[PDB]
């Protein structure tokens, strides 16, 4: 996980747990200890600027991989990246895990682009609960104007009325 975060290519905890049968509590303890001793080695030896490489969220780096796993076109992926970038400004979902934030932004843009993929299929693919995805879409329906990319609705590729109401 440290190596994935270092190369701006970071995976999530569920990925590495899908490879390695590792217990989550002691996995988090081990990651914290390794981060502490790595920062200590950086201070003792050569110093490295983090510039958001050890970032806990890193939600912009999960959008292309999940969009590839769902087989989405590219413009849905860039619109999802723009949405998840603007999801940080929203304080109602700022505390959510980056996995769920990326998934609900992807599902919002799936509904925006009339991509024929149900929320159940997204939940089966990415193991975010369909209730969680539905709640995230419901709580992001009030902030439709800020999240959707302005030049996309300006060029008419998507329109804000395509999103189903709650």
């Amino acid at each position: 996980l440290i190596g994935c975060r270092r190369a701006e290519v970071a995976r999530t905890f569920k990925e590495i747990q899908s490879l390695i049968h590792v217990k989550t509590k002691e996995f988090g303890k081990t990651l914290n200890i390794m981060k502490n001793i790595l920062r200590g080695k950086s201070e003792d030896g050569f110093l490295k600027i983090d510039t958001d490489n050890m970032s806990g969220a890193q939600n912009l780096t999960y959008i292309p991989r999940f969009c590839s796993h769902l087989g989405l076109p590219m413009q849905v992926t860039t619109s999802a990246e723009y949405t998840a970038k603007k999801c940080k400004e929203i304080k109602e979902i700022a505390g959510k895990s980056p996995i769920t934030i990326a998934v609900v932004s992807i599902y919002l843009n799936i509904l925006l682009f009339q991509i024929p993929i149900t929320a159940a299929k997204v939940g089966q693919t990415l193991q975010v609960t369909e209730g969680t995805i539905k709640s995230g879409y419901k709580i992001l329906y009030e902030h439709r104007d800020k999240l959707v990319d302005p030049q996309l609705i300006a060029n008419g590729v998507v329109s804000l009325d395509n999103l189903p109401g709650v």
Binding site: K14, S68, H69, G71
Partner: protein
């Protein structure tokens, strides 16, 4: 039916009701060894068919020893119903037909009384004198069907090509390696079925546990740590703290690494 041979004890009288000797009185039945093509052997060797029904007639014309099969119309219409039986051997020698049947198992000069003989009820069904092959007649209206079938034998392919996945390539890699999908399968979940079991043992007191250990030593003199522990459900520290006082372990004997009663208490 596994059995031992070279029996000088005459055990075959008691273990085999049927006689082990070969029955030979049916050996005079005349048997024709007939070779069949693929379709006819397919329809004449399957066990779901052959219920004693008539399969045809044989016409033997003495003018040139021409032997013909005249099959009935009940089976098919694509196959012919007149076949030329060619005799590749008019006289066949030293060829016999013998049967194999399971027995009734219920109710120099040096020898070894064990040769591992498997006895079976055997009998010559008949004697083979005519080796035959079945060729369909050239003038039959269904002979071209047989030619077409034999051409279709080498024409069709029994193997299909590899299947190419037509969906988006990232959808196929949704399940591979990097994946949110945890395994819902229960295959080889040894840790799941082993970590669910928890043997927890209270500190029930010293006099009762030593009485229990003495009862178990009366039951059996030698005990392992795991066997005694699962018999009494006691912690290994407390069980050892009683066992060193009341018993001892073997380090060198044939019953080594086993806790056995002290010889002061062995006589009691």
């Amino acid at each position: 039916e596994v059995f031992d041979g070279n029996d000088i004890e005459n055990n075959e009288t008691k273990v085999y009701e049927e006689s082990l000797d070969l029955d030979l009185e049916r050996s005079n039945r005349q048997v024709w060894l007939v070779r069949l093509p693929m379709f006819l052997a397919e329809k004449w060797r399957d066990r779901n068919n052959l219920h004693g029904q008539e399969l045809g007639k044989i016409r033997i014309n003495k003018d040139g020893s021409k032997i013909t099969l005249l099959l009935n119309e009940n089976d098919n219409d694509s196959i012919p119903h007149e076949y030329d039986l060619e005799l590749t051997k008019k006289v066949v020698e030293n060829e016999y037909v013998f049967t194999e049947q399971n027995l009734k198992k219920y109710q120099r000069d040096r020898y070894i009384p064990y040769v591992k003989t498997i006895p079976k009820k055997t009998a010559i069904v008949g004697t083979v004198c005519h080796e035959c092959q079945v060729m369909p007649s050239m003038n039959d209206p269904n002979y071209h069907k047989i030619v077409e079938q034999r051409r279709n034998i080498v024409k069709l392919n029994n193997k299909e090509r590899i299947t190419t996945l037509d969906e988006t390539v990232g959808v196929t890699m949704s399940h591979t390696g990097m994946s949110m999908r945890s395994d819902n399968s229960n295959f080889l979940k040894v840790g799941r079925e082993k970590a669910k079991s928890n043997i927890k043992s209270i500190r029930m007191p010293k006099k009762e546990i030593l009485d229990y250990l003495f009862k178990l030593f009366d039951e059996y003199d030698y005990w392992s740590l795991k066997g005694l522990k699962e018999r009494t459900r006691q912690p290994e520290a407390h069980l050892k703290e009683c066992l060193d006082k009341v018993a001892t372990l073997v380090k060198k004997g044939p019953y080594a690494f086993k806790y056995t009663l002290r010889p002061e208490y062995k006589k009691l």
